[PDB]
Amino acid sequence: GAIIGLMVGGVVIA
Amino acid sequence: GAIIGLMVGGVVIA
Amino acid sequence: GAIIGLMVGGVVIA
Amino acid sequence: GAIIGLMVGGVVIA
Amino acid sequence: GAIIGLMVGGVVIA
Amino acid sequence: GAIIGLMVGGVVIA
Amino acid sequence: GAIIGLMVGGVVIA
Amino acid sequence: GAIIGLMVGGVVIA
Amino acid sequence: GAIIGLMVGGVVIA
Amino acid sequence: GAIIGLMVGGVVIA
Amino acid sequence: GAIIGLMVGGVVIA
Amino acid sequence: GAIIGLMVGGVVIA
Amino acid sequence: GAIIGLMVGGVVIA
Amino acid sequence: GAIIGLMVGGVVIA
Amino acid sequence: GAIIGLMVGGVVIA
Amino acid sequence: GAIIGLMVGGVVIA
Amino acid sequence: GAIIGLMVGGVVIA
Amino acid sequence: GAIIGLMVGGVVIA
Amino acid sequence: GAIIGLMVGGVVIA
Amino acid sequence: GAIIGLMVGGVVIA
C-alpha cells in the first residue's frame, strides 16, 4: 500500500 | 505505492 | 510510486 | 514516479 | 519522471 | 479569531 | 478574521 | 477578512 | 476581503 | 475585493 | 442569520 | 442571510 | 442572499 | 442573489 | 441574479 | 458495497 | 464497489 | 470499482 | 476502474 | 482505466 510517517490528523482508507 | 513523510492533515486512499 | 516530503494538507490516491 | 519536496496543499494520484 | 521543489498548490498525476 | 466549519485533520495555532 | 468552510488538511495561524 | 469555501490543503495566515 | 470558492492547495494571507 | 471560483494552486494576498 | 427548509445533512456557518 | 429549499448535502457560508 | 430549489450536493457562499 | 432549479453538484458564490 | 434549470456539475459566480 | 470516508451531509441507499 | 474519500454532500446508490 | 478523492456534491451509482 | 482526484459536482456510474 | 485530476462538473462511466 502507501508508506506514511508522522501523519497529522488525516483520513486513510487502506 | 506512494512514499510520504511528515504529511499534514491529508486524505490517502491507498 | 510518487516520492513526497513535508506535504501540506494534500490528497493522495496511491 | 514524480519527486516532490515541500509541496503545498496539492493533490497527487501516484 | 518530473522533479519539482517547493511546489505551490498544484496537482500531480505521477 | 478565525471562523472554520468542518476542517479536516488540520493544525491551528489560535 | 477569516471565514472558511470545509477546509481540508490545512494549517491556520489565526 | 477573506471568505473561503471548500479550500483544499491550504495554509492561511488570518 | 476576497471571496473564494473551491480553492485548491493554496496559501492565503487574509 | 476579488471574487474567484475554483482557483487552482494559487497564492492570494486578500 | 440563515433561514432554511428541507436541507439535507449540510453544514452552515451563518 | 441565505433562504433555502430542498438542498442536498451542501455547505453554506451565508 | 441566495434562494435555492433542488440543488444537489453543492457549496454556496451567499 | 441566485435562483436555482435542479443544479447537479455545483459550487455557487451568489 | 442568475436563474438556472438542469445545469450539470458547474461552478457559478452570479 | 461502497467504501466511503469523511462523507458530508449525504444520503446513501445501500 | 466504489472507493470514495472526502465526498461532499453527495448521494450514493451502492 | 471507481476510485475517487475529494469529490464535491456528486451522485454515484456504484 | 477509473481513478479520479478532486472531481467537482460530478456523476459517476461505476 | 482512465486517470483524471481536478475534473470539473463531469460525468464518468467507469
Numbering used by the authors:
A (entry chain A), B (entry chain E), C (entry chain I), D (entry chain M), E (entry chain Q), F (entry chain B), ...: 29 to 42
Quoted from the paper:
The Uppsala APP mutation (Δ690–695 in APP, Δ19–24 in Aβ) is the first known multi-codon deletion causing autosomal dominant AD. Discovered in three individuals from a family in Sweden, this mutation gives rise to a dominantly inherited form of early onset fAD. Post mortem analysis of Uppsala APP brain tissue is consistent with typical AD pathology, showing abundant deposition of extracellular Aβ plaques, primarily composed of AβUpp(1–42)Δ19–24 or an N-terminally truncated form, alongside intracellular tau tangles. To summarize, we solved the fibril structures underlying the tau and Aβ pathologies in a transgenic mouse model and a patient carrying the Uppsala APP mutation, the first known multi-codon deletion mutation in the APP gene leading to AD.
In addition, we investigated the structure of AβUpp(1–42)Δ19–24 fibrils formed at pH 2 from synthetic AβUpp(1–42)Δ19–24 monomers by cryo-EM. Subsequent cryo-EM analyses revealed the presence of four abundant polymorphs accounting for 43.5% (PM1), 16.9% (PM2), 14.4% (PM3), and 8.4% (PM4) of all fibrils in the dataset. The cryo-EM structure of PM4 fibrils, solved to a resolution of 3.8 Å, reveals that, in contrast to the other three polymorphs observed in vitro, PM4 fibrils are composed of two copies of two identical protofilaments with a high degree of flexibility in the N-terminal domain between residues D1–K28. Accordingly, the ordered core of all protofilaments for which atomic model building was possible, extends only from G27–A42. These residues fold into the U-shape. The protofilaments are connected by hydrophobic interactions between (i) G35, and V36, and (ii) I31, G33, L34, V39, and I41. However, they all share the same C-terminal U-shape formed by residues K28-A42, which folds around a hydrophobic cluster of residues A30, I32, M35, V40, and A42. All polymorphs are different from the ex vivo AβUpp(1–42)Δ19–24 structures and different from any other published Aβ fibril structure.
